[PDB]
Amino acid sequence: SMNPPPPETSNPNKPKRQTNQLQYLLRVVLKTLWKHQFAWPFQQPVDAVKLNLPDYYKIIKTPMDMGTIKKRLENNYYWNAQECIQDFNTMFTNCYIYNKPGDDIVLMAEALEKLFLQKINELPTE
Numbered sequence: 690s691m692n693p694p695p696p697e698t699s700n701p702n703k704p705k706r707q708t709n710q711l712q713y714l715l716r717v718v719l720k721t722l723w724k725h726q727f728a729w730p731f732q733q734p735v736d737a738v739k740l741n742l743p744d745y746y747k748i749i750k751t752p753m754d755m756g757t758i759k760k761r762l763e764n765n766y767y768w769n770a771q772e773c774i775q776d777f778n779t780m781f782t783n784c785y786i787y788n789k790p791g792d793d794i795v796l797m798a799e800a801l802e803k804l805f806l807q808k809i810n811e812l813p814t815e
């Protein structure tokens with residue numbers, strides 16, 4: 690099987706804006722998670738071809754990753770903060786749906802998810 694195309698990271702038709710919450714999602718939330726020692730499985734789309742996972746995109750029909758989220762924030766793809774928060778929660782849920790619960794990557798995702806949730810608790814006023 691081929692990999693599906695990656696998620697869209699830009700759309701000219703979409704209006705753009707710079708909100709204090711969108712700045713925080715990029716320069717605090719993503720900045721913190723990106724540099725974490727456990728980021729690297731989540732920094733790009735799951736390459737099912739390279740990793741030989743013929744069932745990944747039979748199970749995961751809403752793929753998401755931090756490389757996509759990064760590009761979306763850089764390209765003002767997101768109007769509301771909750772759109773971006775929705776993409777992070779999708780990335781975590783996909784990892785928990787596909788991988789056996791005793792797997793190393795499940796602990797890695799939970800660590801990044803704990804940090805994500807602490808940084809979201811500190812999001813600034815709209």
Ligand SMILES: C#CCOCCOCCNC(=O)CN(CCOCCOCCN(C)c1ccc2nc(-c3cc(C)c(=O)n(C)c3)n(CC3CCOCC3)c2c1)C(=O)c1ccc(C(=O)c2ccccc2)cc1
Nearest residue numbers: 726727729730731735736740742745783784787788793794
């Ligand atoms: C022969 C032949 C070819 O030769 C290639 C050589 O490649 C190794 C060298 N790598 C580098 O130079 C770059 N790099 C970053 C990536 O490193 C992770 C190692 O695997 C990379 C590739 N994989 C397997 C690879 C790549 C991407 C993957 N994505 C997934 C995956 C799969 C599924 C099913 C999924 O749901 N998700 C979300 C992601 N996998 C599968 C593995 C994920 C982790 O558990 C094992 C399966 C990936 C595997 C690093 O050097 C590096 C390392 C480790 C850390 C690190 O974590 C650390 C640890 C301690 C202290 C400090 C830092 C940091 C940087």
